[PDB]
Design a protein around this nucleic acid. Structure first.
Ligand SMILES: CC(C)CC(=O)SCCNC(=O)CCNC(=O)[C@H](O)C(C)(C)COP(=O)(O)OP(=O)(O)OC[C@H]1O[C@@H](n2cnc3c(N)ncnc32)[C@H](O)[C@@H]1OP(=O)(O)O
Ligand SMILES: CC(C)CC(=O)SCCNC(=O)CCNC(=O)[C@H](O)C(C)(C)COP(=O)(O)OP(=O)(O)OC[C@H]1O[C@@H](n2cnc3c(N)ncnc32)[C@H](O)[C@@H]1OP(=O)(O)O
Lengths: 184, 185
DNA sequence: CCTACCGATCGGTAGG
DNA sequence: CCTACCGATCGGTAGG
């Protein structure tokens, strides 16, 4: 019902962008009128905030929740990279791509709320890079450099990847994992 | 030149507020013109973005490829390219370059195929050095495409999180990113 | 949720 | 519901 609308607004806000998508063609896609759409959601800003929260929920469910209980820090980063890459490549959630593209669209309390959820993922990586680097499991590296190098590789995928391209998302994953986390 | 000054001003705005979110009225106000005087120098809004992106590529090719394309050692070329490409972003001087990174799917038709075709000249350049470096054993074997977009991922994503007033300098980010993907081997 | 509309603003163009 | 402009306004659309 409710999240069935975000499913529809996310598809449009993703193809045409937040500022480029209108509340008219969203409601027209949801089979309503501009007025009827405002009954379920407060306004266009709260619509994006909802989409970006529903995205972080799907992210934590299919990535962090699967790798947060791995003892070896480097083994935890490998699995995290492989799961994150498949989340972007498979295209299972367009709410996640909106979070990567509209990174500076929100403002105020809605901005600070999602930003605080994103930095929880950075601190997760900063910690794993600080553990591995100290246990001698990877070449020494500043935990921040590693975290955003990690994030840069996997999250920049949404700008160039296509499922019908040469390689598969599987091959790209194996290649990046071995490229950043090789046996040491 | 007056035309160039308009691309720079219109770039600083379109970077902050975005393309679809910037108005031709406030671009004109920024250029200290009337909205009609603005449309004398630029055809329309679509062509204003196109010109901003071409000017950004000219800058990129001047401040990056032009500085490293004559290096013989392939890994030493990937190290200097990363350095220069990282600084180009952390400096924030060329907001036209940032618009290229963010508004990647804003253009359409021939204007995008044009900018996308100049972009692809940069992945072919990286794929080569990543193919030469693997054959010459200067880096661990890797598919050239996976290496090019790992190079670009680390480097270009910087525009989404870097703040010049953080704890690390743009130099420290370069050293750590280089040493992490192109370590002595 | 619809029909009816609003304040304002959109990209673009008119005559001088 | 000729160059580089200008003051004013075109037809349509935005979020609400
Ligand atoms: C300021 C400066 C630094 C800016 C730049 O130059 S960065 C440009 C390169 N890096 C980017 O992140 C840009 C992302 N946006 C773009 O438009 C990219 O340039 C491209 C998507 C590659 C545009 O290339 P274009 O050929 O015009 O469009 P296509 O998608 O049809 O081309 C396909 C090419 O994309 C890549 N690709 C996409 N999917 C896969 C895949 N599954 N496996 C392997 N490679 C893949 C790949 O490079 C492919 O090229 P080919 O395989 O045909 O040689
Ligand atoms: C699948 C998907 C949903 C996964 C995610 O959640 S995305 C992971 C977030 N990574 C991104 O690149 C997204 C784009 N960037 C952002 O959204 C923001 O920068 C966030 C890091 C998430 C939030 O930043 P926030 O703390 O709210 O506000 P700030 O502007 O003060 O950011 C400061 C933090 O960014 C980093 N940073 C920025 N500049 C520097 C620097 N010069 N040296 C070292 N680190 C730096 C750094 O992590 C910093 O945090 P602190 O150093 O203060 O602890």
């Amino acid at each position: 019902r409710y999240r069935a609308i975000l499913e529809t607004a996310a598809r449009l806000i993703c193809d045409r962008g937040y500022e480029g998508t209108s509340m008219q063609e969203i409601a027209a896609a949801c089979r309503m009128t501009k007025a009827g759409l405002y009954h379920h959601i407060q306004n266009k800003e709260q619509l994006l905030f909802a989409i970006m929260n529903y995205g972080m929920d799907l992210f934590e469910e299919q990535v962090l929740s699967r790798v947060q209980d791995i003892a070896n820090p480097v083994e935890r980063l490998r699995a995290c990279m492989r799961h994150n890459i498949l989340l972007v490549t498979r295209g299972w959630s367009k709410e996640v791509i909106i979070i990567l593209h509209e990174h500076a669209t929100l403002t105020g309390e809605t901005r600070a709320f999602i930003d605080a959820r994103k930095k929880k993922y950075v601190d997760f990586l900063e910690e794993a890079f600080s553990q591995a680097s100290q246990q001698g499991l990877i070449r020494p590296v500043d935990p921040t450099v590693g975290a955003f190098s990690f994030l840069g590789m996997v999250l920049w995928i949404y700008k160039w990847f296509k499922p019908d391209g040469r390689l598969t998302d599987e091959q790209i994953a194996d290649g990046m994992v071995g490229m950043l986390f090789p046996p040491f």
